[PDB]
Subunit: 382 residues, 4 copies
């Protein structure tokens, strides 16, 4: 804030502020921004004149018609091949030297074409990338608490409306990706899909049937009697991330001893998911538990739709808004087998909750192994 | 399914006896299985697989044939291959093929099926990847603010190659924010659009998408070298435009008003101020129809998906409940923002009512449709 | 009042001419005064104070007497003392006392009344201070956790003297959280109670207010030196008590159930875990009636005023809308938390329905009332 | 977590963990906490025995009956004058030396009185401090935009229901105080009452009439024409804090040049207050503007009922959740007079927003001067 600038490199010192500003003791910025009146023609002149001198770099007192033409395009005027001619004719400056007065006289007399505006620039990267969006659908079938119970998945082409059964394991994308991401680039990507197997506040077991076609969710029934966590209810939604695989075969050079299931995840928002429900989550960290000698990661995440999600930036924020959460999660997994004759479970990294960068890395390795699990089978049989 | 454990096939209550551990104690068997000590382990399993056996014994004869017994085992989830069935008969000492339950149970409780093997994984997946690389929108300011050199430029950063391109915010930023695989309830209509702030909340300096300039950057309205500002007061909401829309002057509304030639206008009512040119997903709540010099001039009312109360504003009727006075202020600001400069109040269609969301989004498709025709005729 | 500026006294539309600056331009005078340039300064004031003058000129004669002209000036807010009235007449050249408007206006537009003086301030205030010093609740743990030495003690820190006293959480923490001067809408019923967590969310170790111990600290339930824990599973909500309440065994409900002798029970359903003994304001949402060994055992359902969604849960019917599955889980947890140890399910009154808030708070006053009688009989 | 402790100072090393624990490889804590079964009588014995030895400090193999009596009261038993006698009689230990076996034998045989529990400790600081709570009421009267408009205030004794007119200026408490404050002491007090004079998104003027009886709110009407901010609407709720006074008389040694009105306040939540509406706010900072040479503080605060209040801890948090807010507030006050022929306003402290401790201090000085304004008048005339 001070005075109206031209927008080209200049110098303060010898520029005289419009008189109406000085008289009032208000800067020009302030007068044009907040003064209720518009600038007079007298006032615009003194401004355009300063613009003229700016363009007059060789400060010679006039400008060549090629400059006056850039200046015009700089001031916003649409100067086509025709218009430029009309200006020269108007100024009729045989030597092509145009004075300010002659310029200003011409400007004021030709507020250029009205509706000619009807020109719209259409340049565009034209990233013509069309696609039928799918809407995920789930359907239960069978009787709850029996072996027929299954939660099936389908995509609905919201274009054709055709339904197709899909595998929540292979078909639901792991990363939730925007075709054109609008969130600040300064903000890293953290948006994943999560599949609830066991809802918050419940102890009945369910899981993705990795062995059946389309990988529907089934109840864990053994000898015709549904299974349950006897230790107590679960208190967060427990589930899994799609397109991942904790291979029991080490598959790369820093490979661990997976358990052959999609990576496990715990979502800590306030809302209970229903069985097999899918939703976008934000990964906050991870906890490594040992299960029968196998590495059994539990990704800690929170639904993007929870009211506090936006304040939970990493795993250190959880004890700040959900005190007790990470302690209860840790203690619950350490001891859930003891009431069944088992013993406490052990954890890697001293049972500490690793942060999001660490989690996301584990999640990618898991995505990678899921990917290579596809290659081997998807290609060999084919 | 709150009493006893069912088979998963169409049955009947009355004639089924709840397993003895339940009756004696007064606890439904379901409650015993779910919350009692595992001691009601091998017992409740016998009683359930019994009734299940009796189910398959439909001609009620007291035994089952070897093709039934094996469909059950499948049903009880045992993984059997041609091989393992062979064993069963062999193990189940019965040269007539009639297998009682006790024979079955004792054999069931015999080994607990060959768990080793290669352990199978169904890979049947539907197919639907999309070859397109995700782009990260980038905005860059250049020039000097309040002079005609100021422009807010847009780019796409290929999140694949990391290559950048200049794009048009008008033509290239999608209007609908579409998920490749929408997970939110089917039951929940889609409502997610991009919004370009031109005029930030609490400010009064005029900015606009330069529809006539290549790549349509954002410019400040400057006339005769002097920047322009709303004299009525500051805009108290982010004011802007929806991309890929066009209110063509070649179109009239119920009365005799034509479109105004710019992308459609929008007002984002969250609490957060957007920076000039900033883009973000919003939810549409309704629309307000104003007339500007005989032209129809819609202002879509929307709220940032990032706003604390966004999930609670379902339709336009909800705004007065959580943001009292907002709709009145908006109406009044637009009704009179010209009186200070000599003009007169503006008039509205629909008696200045804020039309609901369904009505607004209809208006938006139409605006998206004409934009599309403009694309094709010129393309 | 959207057209022309009114006098503030009972009038009529029809016969009043909108000031000339309005008519010529097409803008109501109200809009000119509120949004046009102050140029419609001295003009619109003349026209308004004119009509006001004509109002007082009720016998419509064209002038007013010196006691009217001075009641107006009062009304137009000029502060006049016996003195200043003297001047007016003196200034207003009129020995008959009949003052036209032009005479008045020219004199009004003459000086703009003696602004100096001592400048007065009305000090009339109602009276109602309260001599009581505010206390800050303090809680202190002592002893060792999971042994019989563990107690959570309570104190009041006088925010005046800074002197501390041991208090009883049961008897001294107020049940109703009352503002000395409630500012929230009168239209909004009062709903703010204190809640004492005994058993934190996600834990299973038994803690209780020691009703038989002096100052009723919080103790862990230990029997025979061994601490006690719910075997069914963890409590998934903060579970506790409301202070200054008593479910006297000397009282029966509709059927034949008597109170259980402890303060009434509560379940706080927010997202945040409370520490053992922690106290906090909650909103009551409803109540669930359970029977425990023939005794009535209410569990008030409440939510921390500090919770993000608290303002959206108005009554018990709202919980399923924002916390789906919560009420079912609560019902089921209490229906069966004894089956694991050999017991049987518990039964409920009202068909296990969660009664609404009005019903619950009624139950709470009654519990507060009996607590009060217990105070007096023993005091 | 390890083994059941006695709760008195001891030593690890030579304490043998219950056999059932060792056999399982589960700690005792884990077995008693999460094991589904209760301890047997055999198991309680071995525990109570360790408790016995604890109390046996002189480790002599038995205890005097005065110890066994403390131990009992320590284990939770109610041992009145009578009960102690009954125990001695039971143990009949002529020398008063009580062995564990004899103790344990006695304990198991007397699970002490049932319903005798009917004893409730009633000790209480008995801070018997009763009071009729008042409910603030407001009523409009007159015609909006005329000189009769006023917003009146009353208290309703919610006991008697009697209504009494009050002064929002003198009667609404400045600090909102809980009789028994339950929020952690570790959390400083920040709860004030605020009176909206000018609602968010409006430009019509209103104010507390410090000159009229009961100090109702009136519209600013001059020459019969209501007044308005011509610069533009206000964008936050603008009002004042009750029981405060920016005296034009300096009143204490670091006294400034007040403007003779209650201190001004700007509440930045999302919700519009109606004229004269009162609500609890949290003070975040303050901005010092000069007005005609007079100090004219503007307290920046936010309603406790706004959804983000709980995340706004001090003035530095505002640019984090409400970017642009402090800039627009600052610029709005700097220039609101320019459109009326005035000039920009100046600020103390370089126009920077001071933090909450600084604000609250200013607010107290203001409360102090309001208080002394009462003394002088409230006493002299009386
Ligand atoms: Mg796993
Ligand atoms: Mg438009
Ligand atoms: Mg109770
Ligand atoms: Mg002030």
């Amino acid at each position: 804030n001070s005075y109206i600038g031209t927008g080209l490199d200049t110098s303060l010192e010898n520029v005289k502020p419009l008189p109406e500003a000085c008289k009032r003791n208000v800067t020009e910025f302030d007068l044009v921004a907040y003064g209720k009146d518009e600038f007079t023609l007298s006032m615009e002149k003194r401004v355009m004149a300063r613009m003229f001198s700016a363009f007059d770099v060789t400060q010679l007192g006039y400008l060549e018609e090629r400059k006056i033409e850039h200046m015009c395009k700089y001031l916003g005027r649409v100067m086509n091949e025709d218009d430029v001619k009309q200006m020269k004719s108007e100024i009729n400056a045989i030597d092509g030297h145009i004075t300010f007065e002659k310029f200003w006289a011409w400007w004021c007399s030709h507020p250029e074409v009205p509706a000619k505006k009807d020109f719209f620039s259409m340049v565009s990267v034209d990233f013509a990338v069309p696609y039928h969006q799918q809407q995920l659908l789930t359907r239960e079938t069978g009787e709850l608490y029996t072996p027929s119970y299954r939660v099936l998945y389908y995509f609905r082409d919201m274009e054709t409306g055709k339904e197709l059964q899909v595998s929540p394991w292979h078909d639901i994308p792991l990363y939730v990706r925007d075709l054109v991401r609008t969130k600040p680039a300064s903000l890293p990507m953290n948006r994943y899909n999560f599949i609830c197997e066991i809802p918050k506040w419940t102890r009945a077991k369910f899981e993705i049937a990795t062995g059946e076609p389309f990988n529907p969710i089934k109840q864990d029934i053994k000898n015709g009697v549904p299974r349950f966590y006897k230790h107590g209810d679960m208190m967060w939604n427990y589930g899994a991330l799609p397109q991942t695989w904790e291979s029991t075969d080490v598959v790369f050079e820093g490979g661990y001893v997976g358990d052959n299931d999609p990576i496990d995840a715990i979502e800590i928002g306030m809302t209970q998911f229903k069985v097999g429900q899918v939703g976008a989550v934000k990964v906050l960290g991870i906890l490594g538990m040992i299960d029968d000698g196998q590495m059994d990661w539990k990704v800690i995440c929170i639904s993007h739709n929870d009211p506090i999600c936006r304040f939970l930036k990493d795993i250190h924020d959880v004890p700040k808004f959900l005190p007790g959460c990470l302690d209860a999660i840790h203690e619950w997994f350490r001891v859930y087998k003891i009431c069944q004759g088992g013993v406490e479970n052990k954890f890697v990294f001293n049972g500490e909750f690793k942060d999001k960068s660490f989690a996301m890395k584990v999640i990618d390795e898991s995505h990678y192994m899921w990917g290579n699990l596809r290659k081997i089978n998807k290609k060999e049989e084919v």
